[PDB]
Amino acid sequence: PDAQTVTSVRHWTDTLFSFRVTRPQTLRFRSGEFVMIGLLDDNGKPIMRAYSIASPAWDEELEFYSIKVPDGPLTSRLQHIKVGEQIILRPKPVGTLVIDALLPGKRLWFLATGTGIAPFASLMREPEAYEKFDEVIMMHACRTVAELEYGRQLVEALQEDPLIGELVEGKLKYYPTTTREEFHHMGRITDNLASGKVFEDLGIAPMNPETDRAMVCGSLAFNVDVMKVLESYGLREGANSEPREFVVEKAFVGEGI
């Protein structure tokens, strides 16, 4: 179908890699949305899967942060992709993780686990995030330290850029944690928001309906627990049609891995 070419590839761990592809000249999307991408199976039939566009809406190229599931119909194949090869990329962007889907506010929270940081790798590089809000809080929880690397480097590259470094350094608050390995900050996003620990570590006021807006992206179980916690602070799930305090999107469907 619609074919695009891989321009670069980077493996982060034995189960995580990112790659950038050429962008369809017709593509127009909002930072945070996802599209369907895929490869042909052995019978020449499409293996399609939804993927958040990890790059900001203004980037000339498209980037994706992907898991590597051995025996995974798509990623067992995609994990071998090389520069110059191609993938199917359908330019029909959709998704609820968009600023327009949230009432204006002053503090924006990105709550993610595992590859769920993909749509935020996009939003953290979206000019609109820093224009419409005073602070942007990026909470990324993973089992191990290595899983945080892609996000760590991204946040690092932002807060250090010669041009917008000081700017971002002042509004972006990066809060990574591990739950299975030793790290300076640990614990689930749910637990750390509920107990109040994150508000203390970051030296900021607790969550409130009037100023806080959040985007949630992780496993279904994670999404449901974060919702209750957010609701415990008076926030309500919104909609692109009726904007409120928070929005959610599954980082993937199924059990775990």
Ligand SMILES: Cc1cc2nc3c(=O)[nH]c(=O)nc-3n(C[C@H](O)[C@H](O)[C@H](O)COP(=O)(O)OP(=O)(O)OC[C@H]3O[C@@H](n4cnc5c(N)ncnc54)[C@H](O)[C@@H]3O)c2cc1C
């Ligand atoms: C809205 C939406 C957006 C998504 N965006 C991304 C993204 O940006 N990057 C990404 O890697 N995946 C993303 N996923 C998952 C993605 O669509 C595919 O599932 C992934 O490419 C795996 O495909 P597969 O055919 O190799 O394995 P599958 O048969 O699809 O899945 C086998 C099992 O692996 C697990 N799994 C699948 N994907 C993940 C993952 N992301 N993280 C942890 N476990 C997983 C689940 O338990 C799944 O049942 C997204 C899913 C949805 C529903």
Ligand SMILES: NC(=O)c1ccc[n+]([C@@H]2O[C@H](COP(=O)([O-])OP(=O)(O)OC[C@H]3O[C@@H](n4cnc5c(N)ncnc54)[C@H](OP(=O)(O)O)[C@@H]3O)[C@@H](O)[C@H]2O)c1
């Ligand atoms: N059938 C089974 O008994 C079975 C099947 C598959 C995997 N697993 C186990 O699960 C592990 C893989 O990780 P996982 O799925 O538990 O994490 P996960 O969704 O893949 O995502 C990574 C992170 O989200 C956190 N998380 C998971 N559930 C959460 C929730 N309900 N609320 C808030 N945060 C949550 C995890 O913390 P935590 O580490 O505390 O989860 C982890 O930090 C493996 O170590 C494996 O041993 C068990």
Ligand SMILES: CCCCCCCS[C@@H]1O[C@H](CO)[C@@H](O)[C@H](O)[C@H]1O
């Ligand atoms: C003028 C630079 C603006 C801010 C850059 C810091 C983020 S880091 C940067 O982000 C770009 C956009 O996603 C990518 O194309 C690039 O490869 C990546 O290193």
